[PDB]
Amino acid sequence: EVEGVFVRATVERRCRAGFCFDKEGQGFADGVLSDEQLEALESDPLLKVERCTFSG
Amino acid sequence: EVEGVFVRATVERRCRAGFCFDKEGQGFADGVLSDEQLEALESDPLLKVERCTFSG
Amino acid sequence: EVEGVFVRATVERRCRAGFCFDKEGQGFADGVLSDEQLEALESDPLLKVERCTFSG
Amino acid sequence: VDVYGNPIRTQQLREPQTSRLAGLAKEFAQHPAKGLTPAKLARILVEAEQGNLQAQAELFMDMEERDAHLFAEMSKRKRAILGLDWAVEPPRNASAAEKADADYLHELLLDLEGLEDLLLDALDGIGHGYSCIELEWALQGREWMPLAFHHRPQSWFQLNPEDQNELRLRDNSPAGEALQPFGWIIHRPRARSGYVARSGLFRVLAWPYLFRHYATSDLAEMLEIYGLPIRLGKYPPGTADEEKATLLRAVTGLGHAAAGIIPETMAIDFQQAAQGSSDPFLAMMRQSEDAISKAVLGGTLTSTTSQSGGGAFALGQVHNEVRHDLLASDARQLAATLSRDLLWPLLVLNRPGSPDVRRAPRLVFDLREQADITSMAQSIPALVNVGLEIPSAWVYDKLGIPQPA
Amino acid sequence: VDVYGNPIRTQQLREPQTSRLAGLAKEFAQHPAKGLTPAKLARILVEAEQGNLQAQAELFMDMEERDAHLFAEMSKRKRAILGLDWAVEPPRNASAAEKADADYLHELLLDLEGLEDLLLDALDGIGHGYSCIELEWALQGREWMPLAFHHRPQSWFQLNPEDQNELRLRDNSPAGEALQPFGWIIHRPRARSGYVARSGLFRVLAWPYLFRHYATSDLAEMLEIYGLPIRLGKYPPGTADEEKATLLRAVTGLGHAAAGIIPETMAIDFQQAAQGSSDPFLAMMRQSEDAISKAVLGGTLTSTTSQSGGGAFALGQVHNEVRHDLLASDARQLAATLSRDLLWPLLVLNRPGSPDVRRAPRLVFDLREQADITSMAQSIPALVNVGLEIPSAWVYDKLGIPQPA
Amino acid sequence: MQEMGRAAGAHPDELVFALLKAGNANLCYDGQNFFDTDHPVYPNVDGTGFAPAADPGAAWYLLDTSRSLKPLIYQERMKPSFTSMTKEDDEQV
């Protein structure tokens, strides 16, 4: 299963090509991989958070 | 006027064939028909819900 | 710059063509121009607001 | 003016304030206690908190009427006050003019009929949280007189939208009507610190009353069902409607009827009706009654009764803790209310000049407790032979014996 | 200045501090006791620890209102203080000017109306952990006067983010507003050592209250279910909807109805409804009530009652241990608070000069305990005949008899 | 923010007079309009129909009676009581 998605149609901080944006709802809560990079990707839900597990 | 609408891209339990999955249908707080089916279809929302005045 | 858009998740009053619909997320908060019409534009943020600057 | 400083105009004293509100006098209580559930009681209390005191007042009246234990406790508590001797005393180190004013006020109160009824009506505020008594002012020449005291139901008032501690008449307007100065004697005893709506004792006593009511009604129903057992008749296929009715009547009357006969193809089964005891109901009633007794009169003499046992110090033991404290509190609050509302208008209307408010005479209730005459009479001679110069004023005051004149 | 040394400006005394906060006066209590669970209570207490005193204050008010035993105990405890005689005494070996100042303050307190209400409002801090009373200052010429005392709900305040022992008004800002000097009488009795949030007695009493509430509600529900048994009807295949409804109504009314008939193909089974006793519930209620009694008034007279038994030393036996200690503690704390908050502004505004703070007069409550007159009156003559020179001042003070004048 | 109290105080007058305006449009217990020319009486039909109205005041009933079901409760959004102020702008309603 998926512990949480926290999407609400908003990611925390998806930073690519040297610029940090806010979209695509790529929020995860698990230590499967890239936890160090998961800190950077996550840790900034500017807007509201809605958790709807996908049971993946 | 009908009071009752859900327009926050919110999730509700709508059952299509042998399963109940996210979808927005009736989404009203008043009922005159399909009450027994509406109960299954009108399960209160999972996520943020906000109401409007369709006045249909 | 745009100090606040006042758009996310909220919809404000927009009086056009004699009918005041609610859409397009035209929220703003500044003293640049059309300050008097700012009341009419922000006359119905019926839904929850979530500010985010566009840095305009 | 009054004690609160509000300007006083003698023009408005000729007619009662509520005279121009003939609608109020035609109202009837709605009896909200009938069919009362815990949810309804909670809604009533919450609405009262917000300024709708009518329903709360009517519920309190019904509660007083429908509970014998609560009514007996409240009546005993009030009759305790009603039996106290009272006197009017001049202020601290008063002058001759002040002494004369106090004496005249004392004489006026002695000869004023309906004082006991006024005290009884005022004491209703103990349970209701506030009692309003309207005054009738008349002139027998040059001196104003209270013609009569009228107790107005608590359902006639409300709360000010801009002030939760100020009461107002119900005049069909959102803001009500302010109370006329010198037209009322408002008694608001303070058992608990808070607003006027929450200050009633019946607010504390409501829940035990509902518990007792539910227990008593359930016990009455269970006693009604007790007796014969429920018995069910069974009939085979091919029993016509007339035979069905005959079987039904036979089953219905079988409990009273010792004997009966049915075909072997039929059957009657006697099932348990109601098997248990009155122990749970009675336990709940006792718990509620003990709670009411403790809340009204204290948990030393009423609920956990002090039991028997005489003696010289028995009076002190029974009274001083709990009973004396409650008696003194109620008497002092009533005396303060009276001195504020009734004594002051008489002083400022019936006498010349404008005496300072701080020097007004104060009504005092006689809270003197009977002291053992024999023990103390034994004690004095030893002390006086020793050499102590005990004043005679203390003796005369404490024994209740008056000084020689 | 005040006792704490903060500068005092007479300009701000003309208007109450909360006058410019008209929003507060329009608020209504949220009643957090309804639908309260142990998790909710724990969250409320923890949040209160962090500076959110509104919910805690409202919960405490509801707890006081909804529990008759707790309310009776608290009322008895407070009325114990309210009945004590009090006096204002000059400092140690005071001079003539200090004696005159103390006498004037004593006269002013005697003639100050609403003292009893002030004491009652202050005593709320015993349970709530802190009580704030706002002052109305007025000038009758050249001398400042407390016009009235207003008790403000504990829900109107909060904790300073930078200080957990300093209270502040709720003015919509994160840091609140500091309390105006000379504008309040803050009473904060200290039953336990700690911060102001944790210092209330209701914090100790909350859990027994919840236990008792749960037990009483469960007992009421079980009494409601008691009586008739639950009985279930069974029908065979081929029973239409109308016949199903008829069977359902028959089963529903069968308990009240002594007799009934059904086809042999149907069946009704009478199952146990609720079989047990009130013993567990009542045991829990008794445990909680004993805990409350011990916590409020001590486990020697209320919970484990001292029982009957008179005698000359019976007063001492009942009082000195537990009751006298609690009475003296409460009276001393209240007197200290009053001397700090009310006596000092009067001394420093109504009189000339700048007297040293250490020499301010102190309000003293009369804690004198009735001494056996007969035994001691027997005792003196032997001692005096022996040769001992006992001072008369000690006798007059201890007996309560005043010295000759 | 406290002016909402004045607004609420003025509200009952607005509600009562809006119902008074609707009087012609709205229906009474008879089933006809409040101000109608065909009010049904037992044997026959009666009739009572800029913006006028003639009413009694001394009767045991007052026309167009109001209903102060709940007081002018004040609803506020101050600080750590709503999400509008932490996970949102510094907004208060």
PDB file of N, CA and C in Angstrom, chain C residues 11-55:
ATOM      1  N   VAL C  11     -13.192  31.712  -4.859  1.00  0.00           N
ATOM      2  CA  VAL C  11     -13.776  32.337  -6.037  1.00  0.00           C
ATOM      3  C   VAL C  11     -14.465  33.620  -5.595  1.00  0.00           C
ATOM      4  N   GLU C  12     -14.209  34.711  -6.311  1.00  0.00           N
ATOM      5  CA  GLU C  12     -14.659  36.039  -5.923  1.00  0.00           C
ATOM      6  C   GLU C  12     -15.765  36.530  -6.849  1.00  0.00           C
ATOM      7  N   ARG C  13     -16.345  37.672  -6.479  1.00  0.00           N
ATOM      8  CA  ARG C  13     -17.414  38.272  -7.267  1.00  0.00           C
ATOM      9  C   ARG C  13     -16.844  38.913  -8.526  1.00  0.00           C
ATOM     10  N   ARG C  14     -17.484  38.648  -9.664  1.00  0.00           N
ATOM     11  CA  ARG C  14     -17.069  39.213 -10.946  1.00  0.00           C
ATOM     12  C   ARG C  14     -18.331  39.636 -11.692  1.00  0.00           C
ATOM     13  N   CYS C  15     -18.641  40.930 -11.648  1.00  0.00           N
ATOM     14  CA  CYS C  15     -19.837  41.468 -12.287  1.00  0.00           C
ATOM     15  C   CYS C  15     -19.502  41.831 -13.728  1.00  0.00           C
ATOM     16  N   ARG C  16     -20.057  41.072 -14.673  1.00  0.00           N
ATOM     17  CA  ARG C  16     -19.832  41.301 -16.092  1.00  0.00           C
ATOM     18  C   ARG C  16     -21.122  41.059 -16.857  1.00  0.00           C
ATOM     19  N   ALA C  17     -21.398  41.932 -17.829  1.00  0.00           N
ATOM     20  CA  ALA C  17     -22.556  41.796 -18.712  1.00  0.00           C
ATOM     21  C   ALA C  17     -23.866  41.748 -17.931  1.00  0.00           C
ATOM     22  N   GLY C  18     -23.914  42.421 -16.783  1.00  0.00           N
ATOM     23  CA  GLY C  18     -25.113  42.480 -15.977  1.00  0.00           C
ATOM     24  C   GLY C  18     -25.349  41.283 -15.084  1.00  0.00           C
ATOM     25  N   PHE C  19     -24.577  40.211 -15.240  1.00  0.00           N
ATOM     26  CA  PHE C  19     -24.675  39.027 -14.397  1.00  0.00           C
ATOM     27  C   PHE C  19     -23.349  38.831 -13.682  1.00  0.00           C
ATOM     28  N   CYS C  20     -23.400  38.722 -12.357  1.00  0.00           N
ATOM     29  CA  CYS C  20     -22.198  38.623 -11.531  1.00  0.00           C
ATOM     30  C   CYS C  20     -21.947  37.152 -11.221  1.00  0.00           C
ATOM     31  N   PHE C  21     -21.206  36.494 -12.110  1.00  0.00           N
ATOM     32  CA  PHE C  21     -20.799  35.116 -11.894  1.00  0.00           C
ATOM     33  C   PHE C  21     -19.638  35.072 -10.903  1.00  0.00           C
ATOM     34  N   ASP C  22     -19.152  33.863 -10.630  1.00  0.00           N
ATOM     35  CA  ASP C  22     -18.036  33.643  -9.713  1.00  0.00           C
ATOM     36  C   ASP C  22     -17.080  32.651 -10.368  1.00  0.00           C
ATOM     37  N   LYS C  23     -15.978  33.160 -10.925  1.00  0.00           N
ATOM     38  CA  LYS C  23     -14.956  32.300 -11.510  1.00  0.00           C
ATOM     39  C   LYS C  23     -13.755  33.111 -11.987  1.00  0.00           C
ATOM     40  N   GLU C  24     -12.748  32.423 -12.521  1.00  0.00           N
ATOM     41  CA  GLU C  24     -11.530  32.966 -13.120  1.00  0.00           C
ATOM     42  C   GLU C  24     -10.492  33.390 -12.084  1.00  0.00           C
ATOM     43  N   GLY C  25     -10.796  33.332 -10.789  1.00  0.00           N
ATOM     44  CA  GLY C  25      -9.797  33.597  -9.772  1.00  0.00           C
ATOM     45  C   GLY C  25      -9.092  34.929  -9.937  1.00  0.00           C
ATOM     46  N   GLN C  26      -9.859  36.010 -10.083  1.00  0.00           N
ATOM     47  CA  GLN C  26      -9.305  37.339 -10.307  1.00  0.00           C
ATOM     48  C   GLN C  26      -8.972  38.066  -9.005  1.00  0.00           C
ATOM     49  N   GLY C  27      -8.759  37.334  -7.915  1.00  0.00           N
ATOM     50  CA  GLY C  27      -8.457  37.981  -6.653  1.00  0.00           C
ATOM     51  C   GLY C  27      -7.143  38.735  -6.700  1.00  0.00           C
ATOM     52  N   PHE C  28      -7.100  39.853  -5.978  1.00  0.00           N
ATOM     53  CA  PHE C  28      -5.888  40.652  -5.840  1.00  0.00           C
ATOM     54  C   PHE C  28      -6.018  41.505  -4.587  1.00  0.00           C
ATOM     55  N   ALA C  29      -4.875  41.999  -4.104  1.00  0.00           N
ATOM     56  CA  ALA C  29      -4.856  42.857  -2.918  1.00  0.00           C
ATOM     57  C   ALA C  29      -3.685  43.828  -3.058  1.00  0.00           C
ATOM     58  N   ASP C  30      -3.966  45.025  -3.562  1.00  0.00           N
ATOM     59  CA  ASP C  30      -2.944  46.053  -3.733  1.00  0.00           C
ATOM     60  C   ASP C  30      -3.641  47.375  -4.027  1.00  0.00           C
ATOM     61  N   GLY C  31      -2.863  48.454  -3.958  1.00  0.00           N
ATOM     62  CA  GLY C  31      -3.364  49.784  -4.249  1.00  0.00           C
ATOM     63  C   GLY C  31      -2.814  50.342  -5.544  1.00  0.00           C
ATOM     64  N   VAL C  32      -2.754  49.508  -6.581  1.00  0.00           N
ATOM     65  CA  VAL C  32      -2.148  49.923  -7.844  1.00  0.00           C
ATOM     66  C   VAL C  32      -3.141  50.724  -8.681  1.00  0.00           C
ATOM     67  N   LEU C  33      -4.261  50.105  -9.049  1.00  0.00           N
ATOM     68  CA  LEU C  33      -5.243  50.758  -9.902  1.00  0.00           C
ATOM     69  C   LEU C  33      -6.594  50.091  -9.697  1.00  0.00           C
ATOM     70  N   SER C  34      -7.646  50.797 -10.113  1.00  0.00           N
ATOM     71  CA  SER C  34      -9.021  50.311  -9.976  1.00  0.00           C
ATOM     72  C   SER C  34      -9.311  49.919  -8.531  1.00  0.00           C
ATOM     73  N   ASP C  35      -8.837  50.744  -7.596  1.00  0.00           N
ATOM     74  CA  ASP C  35      -9.011  50.434  -6.182  1.00  0.00           C
ATOM     75  C   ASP C  35     -10.487  50.396  -5.806  1.00  0.00           C
ATOM     76  N   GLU C  36     -11.280  51.324  -6.346  1.00  0.00           N
ATOM     77  CA  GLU C  36     -12.706  51.342  -6.044  1.00  0.00           C
ATOM     78  C   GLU C  36     -13.386  50.063  -6.520  1.00  0.00           C
ATOM     79  N   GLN C  37     -13.039  49.595  -7.720  1.00  0.00           N
ATOM     80  CA  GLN C  37     -13.596  48.351  -8.236  1.00  0.00           C
ATOM     81  C   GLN C  37     -13.040  47.121  -7.531  1.00  0.00           C
ATOM     82  N   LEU C  38     -12.012  47.286  -6.693  1.00  0.00           N
ATOM     83  CA  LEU C  38     -11.501  46.152  -5.931  1.00  0.00           C
ATOM     84  C   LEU C  38     -12.564  45.596  -4.995  1.00  0.00           C
ATOM     85  N   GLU C  39     -13.428  46.457  -4.455  1.00  0.00           N
ATOM     86  CA  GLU C  39     -14.522  45.977  -3.616  1.00  0.00           C
ATOM     87  C   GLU C  39     -15.456  45.073  -4.408  1.00  0.00           C
ATOM     88  N   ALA C  40     -15.846  45.508  -5.608  1.00  0.00           N
ATOM     89  CA  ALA C  40     -16.726  44.695  -6.439  1.00  0.00           C
ATOM     90  C   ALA C  40     -16.056  43.387  -6.831  1.00  0.00           C
ATOM     91  N   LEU C  41     -14.764  43.439  -7.162  1.00  0.00           N
ATOM     92  CA  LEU C  41     -14.055  42.221  -7.544  1.00  0.00           C
ATOM     93  C   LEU C  41     -13.963  41.246  -6.375  1.00  0.00           C
ATOM     94  N   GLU C  42     -13.700  41.752  -5.169  1.00  0.00           N
ATOM     95  CA  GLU C  42     -13.588  40.931  -3.970  1.00  0.00           C
ATOM     96  C   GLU C  42     -14.872  40.939  -3.148  1.00  0.00           C
ATOM     97  N   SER C  43     -16.021  41.085  -3.801  1.00  0.00           N
ATOM     98  CA  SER C  43     -17.294  41.161  -3.098  1.00  0.00           C
ATOM     99  C   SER C  43     -17.861  39.795  -2.742  1.00  0.00           C
ATOM    100  N   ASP C  44     -17.241  38.704  -3.187  1.00  0.00           N
ATOM    101  CA  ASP C  44     -17.765  37.382  -2.876  1.00  0.00           C
ATOM    102  C   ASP C  44     -16.681  36.314  -2.931  1.00  0.00           C
ATOM    103  N   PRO C  45     -15.623  36.417  -2.122  1.00  0.00           N
ATOM    104  CA  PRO C  45     -14.729  35.266  -1.957  1.00  0.00           C
ATOM    105  C   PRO C  45     -15.412  34.201  -1.117  1.00  0.00           C
ATOM    106  N   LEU C  46     -16.451  33.604  -1.707  1.00  0.00           N
ATOM    107  CA  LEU C  46     -17.309  32.674  -0.983  1.00  0.00           C
ATOM    108  C   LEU C  46     -16.518  31.499  -0.426  1.00  0.00           C
ATOM    109  N   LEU C  47     -15.523  31.031  -1.166  1.00  0.00           N
ATOM    110  CA  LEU C  47     -14.800  29.815  -0.836  1.00  0.00           C
ATOM    111  C   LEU C  47     -13.461  30.142  -0.178  1.00  0.00           C
ATOM    112  N   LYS C  48     -12.894  29.139   0.488  1.00  0.00           N
ATOM    113  CA  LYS C  48     -11.677  29.351   1.266  1.00  0.00           C
ATOM    114  C   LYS C  48     -10.542  29.846   0.381  1.00  0.00           C
ATOM    115  N   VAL C  49      -9.778  30.803   0.902  1.00  0.00           N
ATOM    116  CA  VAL C  49      -8.718  31.465   0.154  1.00  0.00           C
ATOM    117  C   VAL C  49      -7.369  30.935   0.613  1.00  0.00           C
ATOM    118  N   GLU C  50      -6.379  31.074  -0.264  1.00  0.00           N
ATOM    119  CA  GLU C  50      -5.029  30.588   0.000  1.00  0.00           C
ATOM    120  C   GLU C  50      -4.085  31.416  -0.863  1.00  0.00           C
ATOM    121  N   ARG C  51      -3.454  32.420  -0.263  1.00  0.00           N
ATOM    122  CA  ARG C  51      -2.719  33.414  -1.033  1.00  0.00           C
ATOM    123  C   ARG C  51      -1.435  32.816  -1.598  1.00  0.00           C
ATOM    124  N   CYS C  52      -0.960  33.374  -2.710  1.00  0.00           N
ATOM    125  CA  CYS C  52       0.328  32.974  -3.276  1.00  0.00           C
ATOM    126  C   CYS C  52       0.758  34.040  -4.274  1.00  0.00           C
ATOM    127  N   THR C  53       1.878  34.699  -3.994  1.00  0.00           N
ATOM    128  CA  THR C  53       2.333  35.798  -4.838  1.00  0.00           C
ATOM    129  C   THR C  53       2.766  35.299  -6.211  1.00  0.00           C
ATOM    130  N   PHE C  54       2.441  36.082  -7.240  1.00  0.00           N
ATOM    131  CA  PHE C  54       2.963  35.857  -8.581  1.00  0.00           C
ATOM    132  C   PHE C  54       4.227  36.660  -8.864  1.00  0.00           C
ATOM    133  N   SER C  55       4.649  37.523  -7.937  1.00  0.00           N
ATOM    134  CA  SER C  55       5.866  38.316  -8.100  1.00  0.00           C
ATOM    135  C   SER C  55       5.831  39.121  -9.397  1.00  0.00           C
TER     136      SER C  55
END
